[PDB]
RNA sequence: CUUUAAAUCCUUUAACGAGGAUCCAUUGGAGGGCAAGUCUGGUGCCAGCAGCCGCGGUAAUUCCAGCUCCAAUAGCGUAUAUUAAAGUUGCUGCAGUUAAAAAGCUCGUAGUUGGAUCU
């Protein structure tokens, strides 16, 4: 069946990115889904989208500039610690110049900068480039 | 394309589809660059400016190269509104 | 009597199924790459 | 596909060990048949009387006798095929003499053209073919 | 002397193409070498990767032709690939360094941490494929060297990398599919879209039309 | 399979006596010998991009 | 029980290619311009340089106000700066990364006494190292392969006992001397 | 009689100690993998070499040797165990149409995995 709905909404959008259109439909839409389609926003990779509001579970309908190489999910959720973060930014990211990790940690979910940063670990969600 | 001191070291800055914006690759020999001639207000006559769209071969291939020039033109102000 | 002599080119197009195929693809690689 | 989820350790350390069987070394080395039936008994070398002197029919595309010695290891009394390396290196090797033989090279599988044979003679009567044969060393009498 | 055929050809002869960037940046195709020797002159050094005899059978017996791999490029930021097939092995060599030549693409080199100084290494990890030979470059610190088998080492080195890592998967015996894959991981360095190249594209006029009172007067 | 012929052709080859020639030198001295033979001469070389030990 | 040590390191790694081209050329080439007795020399200063490149890489991959990372990124600039391999101004750990094996046989006891003139060669300079003719500061060094630091680099010497840098004739002049 | 519990040992001093500095460096190789001779004699599918492909059948680049080269070097071959190479055990990270492979099919327990949603 659909588990890790996320996954749906990261492999979407990255087969409209491979095909050249300018908008995807997600669904079903998630907090957690938002909440990567923010972080991946602020960085520019995804621009502008919008939650079309059904009353059982939302729709996303995302704009798409041509800027995204791939987003990806990384499942199960693995527990990664502050330590264990660059092993994992050498194993998913294409070099150290670009490239983020997002990572669900007790303080929101943010890209792997902004994780170190505020020096917490967490649970690896999913990476885009 | 830049180092710490703030230089551009990359050999060249390729084009970008217009479309797409996707990098066209140096050895892509079926993607194009249109130029659309500008016409005058009030004559309708050429102006000597254009402007260009730069369309990447696969865009060609797949036969939405005619849909992605007309809607670049209808962004552009030279095809009007419907 | 005196014996003719032989480019590594032909060399190998001579012998390049033989006996001494790989002596002449190491003589011809030396002749085109070789300092 | 394999299963990924966090708490399938268990099926994946099991799988892995189980398929790990289908693997020709591991279960060469771990099964323990294989060091059952060796010869030598997992040793590099072992030390045995020559039985006899035996020609070996070189195989089917090229042609000679390679000179060998049937003998039998005085650890296990097991009968052994042992090459004997150089030329005329036969001819330093008598009945019933002592020789130290080791392996030919490929862990147990027959090395060449000699059919069967798995050892090579490295010492006889103490002093090595070598040594015989480079004329460091006579034979002791 | 040499007298162009093509119109990129007869631009390039009468000095007003600038660089091998700008048919570069507009994707014409080279058709002529000559363009390629009188961009990067002797700089461009080349290496025979390989000669290898392929055999057709016939009636009479085996017709066997020569197959010769070669690599060329000066080594900073261009390199090419030719492969030719001929009845004798001169011809074969100097109809692969025409191909090579006609087949320069240019690389695209980058920073693996710091951006101090040249840019030594690939600007992302790239992959090239060629029947079943997959070919990845990753970037490495600066002094690492290229840790690569011998061929893509060569191609590697004649591109002006300094410094690389690299992984292999298939049959890499094969030297023509080896070598083509590694063509292909470095000629992809520069269709990776990377952040630094989001700056929207300014156009500048195409030398078929930025010299055509050129073109139409001779 | 007869044993008879062991050692056969070692045995009649003709033996010829290793000539008397000077030592070589060992250490440092003979990686300087090949040092200076392989990139301090370069005249030498007839342009056949041969290699050292060639005799034809 | 024994009150000894078992602490012993080797010193060198040998190439996984034992026949290459490339690779022979560029240690015989290096052997004949530092006068160095065989390739292990030459392997032991690569394996130097790629501990040394190996330290450099793992402080680079910390935090740049990590305690550890400044703790021992400015003892390994300071020993780099302190033997001669690298310059004062460029005390980074980037720059670390940019050395090679050339700047670490520069600083052998062998190349300094050629490059200070007390050798006409780089192998008349190991023989006189060997032979006891050389000092650094007071203490007569006889390894060749004795690394100089930056401040013992002008107290190299001809020696106090030598017939160089002494006055008391060798073996073989005393004997010619004896015949007059 | 420096060391040490009593002679050692290198450290220090002194005498004698090098022009084939005979005060004489070896171990494996020279077809390819893989660095380095289709040079010269002997052998003639024999003897033997060859980890693998292969070399030897009277004109051997491969055996037995002589010269000459080359790799490491006070060290270098060999056998065996094991590690990397092996993304040929694959968690990272393999494969299952035809190369080895998806159970004949379905149900079903343990196991594994489980849709939005609460500042």
């Given at each position: 069946?659909?588990?890790?709905?996320?996954?749906?909404?990261?492999?979407?959008?990255?087969?409209?990115?491979?095909?050249?259109?300018?908008?995807?439909?997600?669904?079903?839409?998630?907090?957690?889904?938002?909440?990567?389609?923010?972080?991946?926003?602020?960085?520019?990779?995804?621009?502008?989208?919008?939650?079309?509001?059904?009353?059982?579970?939302?729709?996303?309908?995302?704009?798409?500039?041509?800027?995204?190489?791939?987003?990806?999910?990384?499942?199960?959720?693995?527990?990664?610690?502050?330590?264990?973060?660059?092993?994992?930014?050498?194993?998913?990211?294409?070099?150290?110049?670009?490239?983020?990790?997002?990572?669900?940690?007790?303080?929101?979910?943010?890209?792997?900068?902004?994780?170190?940063?505020?020096?917490?670990?967490?649970?690896?969600?999913?990476?885009?480039? | 394309?830049?180092?710490?001191?703030?230089?551009?070291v990359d050999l060249y800055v390729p084009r970008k589809?217009?479309?797409?914006?996707?990098?066209?690759?140096?050895?892509?020999?079926?993607?194009?660059?249109?130029?659309?001639?500008?016409?005058?207000?009030?004559?309708?006559?050429?102006?000597?400016?254009?402007?260009?769209?730069?369309?990447?071969?696969?865009?060609?291939?797949?036969?939405?190269?005619?849909?992605?020039?007309?809607?670049?033109?209808?962004?552009?102000?030279?095809?009007?509104?419907? | 009597?005196?014996?003719?002599?032989?480019?590594?080119?032909?060399?190998?197009?001579?012998?390049?199924?033989?006996?001494?195929?790989?002596?002449?693809?190491?003589?011809?690689?030396?002749?085109?790459?070789?300092? | 596909?394999?299963?990924?989820?966090?708490?399938?350790?268990?099926?994946?350390?099991?799988?892995?060990?189980?398929?790990?069987?289908?693997?020709?070394?591991?279960?060469?080395?771990?099964?323990?048949?294989?060091?059952?039936?060796?010869?030598?008994?997992?040793?590099?070398?072992?030390?045995?009387?020559?039985?006899?002197?035996?020609?070996?029919?070189?195989?089917?595309?090229?042609?000679?006798?390679?000179?060998?010695?049937?003998?039998?290891?005085?650890?296990?009394?097991?009968?052994?095929?042992?090459?004997?390396?150089?030329?005329?290196?036969?001819?330093?090797?008598?009945?019933?003499?002592?020789?130290?033989?080791?392996?030919?090279?490929?862990?147990?599988?027959?090395?060449?053209?000699?059919?069967?044979?798995?050892?090579?003679?490295?010492?006889?009567?103490?002093?090595?073919?070598?040594?015989?044969?480079?004329?460091?060393?006579?034979?002791?009498? | 002397?040499?007298?162009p055929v093509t119109k990129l050809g007869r631009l390039?002869?009468?000095?007003?193409?600038?660089?091998?960037?700008?048919?570069?940046?507009?994707?014409?195709?080279?058709?002529?070498?000559?363009?390629?020797?009188?961009?990067?002159?002797?700089?461009?050094?080349?290496?025979?990767?390989?000669?290898?005899?392929?055999?057709?059978?016939?009636?009479?017996?085996?017709?066997?032709?020569?197959?010769?791999?070669?690599?060329?490029?000066?080594?900073?930021?261009?390199?090419?690939?030719?492969?030719?097939?001929?009845?004798?092995?001169?011809?074969?060599?100097?109809?692969?360094?025409?191909?090579?030549?006609?087949?320069?693409?240019?690389?695209?080199?980058?920073?693996?941490?710091?951006?101090?100084?040249?840019?030594?290494?690939?600007?992302?990890?790239?992959?090239?494929?060629?029947?079943?030979?997959?070919?990845?470059?990753?970037?490495?610190?600066?002094?690492?060297?290229?840790?690569?088998?011998?061929?893509?080492?060569?191609?590697?080195?004649?591109?002006?990398?300094?410094?690389?890592?690299?992984?292999?998967?298939?049959?890499?015996?094969?030297?023509?599919?080896?070598?083509?894959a590694t063509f292909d991981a470095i000629s992809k360095?520069?269709?990776?879209?990377?952040?630094?190249?989001?700056?929207?594209?300014?156009?500048?006029?195409?030398?078929?039309?930025?010299?055509?009172?050129?073109?139409?007067?001779? | 399979?007869?044993?008879?012929?062991?050692?056969?052709?070692?045995?009649?080859?003709?033996?010829?006596?290793?000539?008397?020639?000077?030592?070589?030198?060992?250490?440092?001295?003979?990686?300087?010998?090949?040092?200076?033979?392989?990139?301090?001469?370069?005249?030498?070389?007839?342009?056949?991009?041969?290699?050292?030990?060639?005799?034809? | 029980?024994?009150?000894?040590?078992?602490?012993?390191?080797?010193?060198?790694?040998?190439?996984?290619?034992?026949?290459?081209?490339?690779?022979?050329?560029?240690?015989?080439?290096?052997?004949?311009?530092?006068?160095?007795?065989?390739?292990?020399?030459?392997?032991?200063?690569?394996?130097?340089?790629?501990?040394?490149?190996?330290?450099?890489?793992?402080?680079?991959?910390?935090?740049?106000?990590?305690?550890?990372?400044?703790?021992?990124?400015?003892?390994?600039?300071?020993?780099?700066?302190?033997?001669?391999?690298?310059?004062?101004?460029?005390?980074?750990?980037?720059?670390?990364?940019?050395?090679?094996?050339?700047?670490?046989?520069?600083?052998?006891?062998?190349?300094?006494?050629?490059?200070?003139?007390?050798?006409?060669?780089?192998?008349?300079?190991?023989?006189?190292?060997?032979?006891?003719?050389?000092?650094?500061?007071?203490?007569?060094?006889?390894?060749?392969?004795?690394?100089?630091?930056?401040?013992?680099?002008?107290?190299?010497?001809?020696?106090?006992?030598?017939?160089?840098?002494?006055?008391?004739?060798?073996?073989?002049?005393?004997?010619?001397?004896?015949?007059?």
């Amino acid at each position: 069946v659909r588990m890790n709905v996320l996954a749906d909404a990261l492999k979407s959008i990255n087969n409209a990115e491979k095909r050249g259109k300018r908008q995807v439909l997600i669904r079903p839409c998630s907090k957690v889904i938002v909440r990567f389609l923010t972080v991946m926003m602020k960085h520019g990779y995804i621009g502008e989208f919008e939650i079309i509001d059904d009353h059982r579970a939302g729709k996303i309908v995302v704009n798409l500039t041509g800027r995204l190489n791939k987003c990806g999910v990384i499942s199960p959720r693995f527990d990664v610690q502050l330590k264990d973060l660059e092993k994992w930014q050498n194993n998913l990211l294409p070099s150290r110049q670009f490239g983020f990790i997002v990572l669900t940690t007790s303080a929101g979910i943010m890209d792997h900068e902004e994780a170190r940063r505020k020096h917490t670990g967490g649970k690896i969600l999913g990476f885009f480039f | 394309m830049q180092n710490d001191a703030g230089e551009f070291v990359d050999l060249y800055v390729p084009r970008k589809c217009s479309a797409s914006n996707r990098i066209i690759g140096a050895k892509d020999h079926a993607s194009i660059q249109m130029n659309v001639a500008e016409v005058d207000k009030v004559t309708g006559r050429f102006n000597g400016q254009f402007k260009t769209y730069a369309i990447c071969g696969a865009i060609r291939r797949m036969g939405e190269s005619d849909d992605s020039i007309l809607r670049l033109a209808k962004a552009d102000g030279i095809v009007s509104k419907n | 009597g005196t014996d003719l002599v032989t480019d590594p080119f032909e060399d190998f197009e001579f012998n390049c199924n033989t006996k001494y195929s790989g002596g002449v693809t190491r003589n011809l690689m030396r002749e085109l790459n070789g300092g | 596909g394999k299963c990924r989820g966090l708490r399938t350790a268990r099926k994946l350390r099991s799988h892995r060990r189980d398929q790990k069987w289908h693997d020709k070394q591991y279960k060469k080395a771990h099964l323990g048949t294989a060091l059952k039936a060796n010869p030598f008994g997992g040793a590099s070398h072992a030390k045995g009387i020559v039985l006899e002197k035996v020609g070996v029919e070189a195989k089917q595309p090229n042609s000679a006798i390679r000179k060998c010695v049937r003998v039998q290891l005085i650890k296990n009394g097991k009968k052994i095929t042992a090459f004997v390396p150089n030329d005329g290196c036969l001819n330093f090797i008598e009945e019933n003499d002592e020789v130290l033989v080791a392996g030919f090279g490929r862990k147990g599988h027959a090395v060449g053209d000699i059919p069967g044979v798995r050892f090579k003679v490295v010492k006889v009567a103490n002093v090595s073919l070598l040594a015989l044969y480079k004329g460091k060393k006579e034979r002791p009498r | 002397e040499w007298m162009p055929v093509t119109k990129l050809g007869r631009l390039v002869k009468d000095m007003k193409i600038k660089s091998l960037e700008e048919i570069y940046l507009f994707s014409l195709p080279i058709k002529e070498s000559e363009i390629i020797d009188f961009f990067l002159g002797a700089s461009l050094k080349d290496e025979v990767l390989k000669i290898m005899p392929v055999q057709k059978q016939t009636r009479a017996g085996q017709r066997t032709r020569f197959k010769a791999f070669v690599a060329i490029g000066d080594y900073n930021g261009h390199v090419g690939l030719g492969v030719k097939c001929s009845k004798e092995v001169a011809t074969a060599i100097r109809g692969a360094i025409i191909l090579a030549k006609l087949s320069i693409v240019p690389v695209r080199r980058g920073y693996w941490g710091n951006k101090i100084g040249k840019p030594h290494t690939v600007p992302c990890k790239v992959t090239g494929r060629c029947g079943s030979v997959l070919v990845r470059l990753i970037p490495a610190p600066r002094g690492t060297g290229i840790v690569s088998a011998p061929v893509p080492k060569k191609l590697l080195m004649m591109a002006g990398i300094d410094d690389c890592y690299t992984s292999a998967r298939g049959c890499t015996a094969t030297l023509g599919n080896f070598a083509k894959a590694t063509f292909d991981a470095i000629s992809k360095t520069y269709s990776y879209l990377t952040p630094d190249l989001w700056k929207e594209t300014v156009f500048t006029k195409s030398p078929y039309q930025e010299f055509t009172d050129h073109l139409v007067k001779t | 399979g007869s044993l008879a012929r062991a050692g056969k052709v070692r045995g009649q080859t003709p033996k010829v006596a290793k000539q008397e020639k000077k030592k070589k030198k060992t250490g440092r001295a003979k990686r300087r010998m090949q040092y200076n033979r392989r990139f301090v001469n370069v005249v030498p070389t007839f342009g056949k991009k041969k290699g050292p030990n060639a005799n034809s | 029980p024994v009150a000894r040590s078992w602490v012993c390191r080797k010193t060198y790694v040998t190439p996984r290619r034992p026949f290459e081209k490339s690779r022979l050329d560029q240690e015989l080439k290096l052997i004949g311009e530092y006068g160095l007795r065989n390739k292990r020399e030459v392997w032991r200063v690569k394996f130097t340089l790629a501990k040394i490149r190996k330290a450099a890489r793992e402080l680079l991959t910390l935090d740049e106000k990590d305690p550890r990372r400044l703790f021992e990124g400015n003892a390994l600039l300071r020993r780099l700066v302190r033997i001669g391999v690298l310059d004062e101004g460029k005390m980074k750990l980037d720059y670390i990364l940019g050395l090679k094996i050339e700047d670490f046989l520069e600083r052998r006891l062998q190349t300094q006494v050629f490059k200070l003139g007390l050798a006409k060669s780089i192998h008349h300079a190991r023989v006189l190292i060997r032979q006891r003719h050389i000092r650094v500061r007071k203490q007569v060094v006889n390894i060749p392969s004795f690394i100089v630091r930056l401040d013992s680099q002008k107290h190299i010497d001809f020696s106090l006992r030598s017939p160089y840098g002494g006055g008391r004739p060798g073996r073989v002049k005393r004997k010619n001397a004896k015949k007059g």
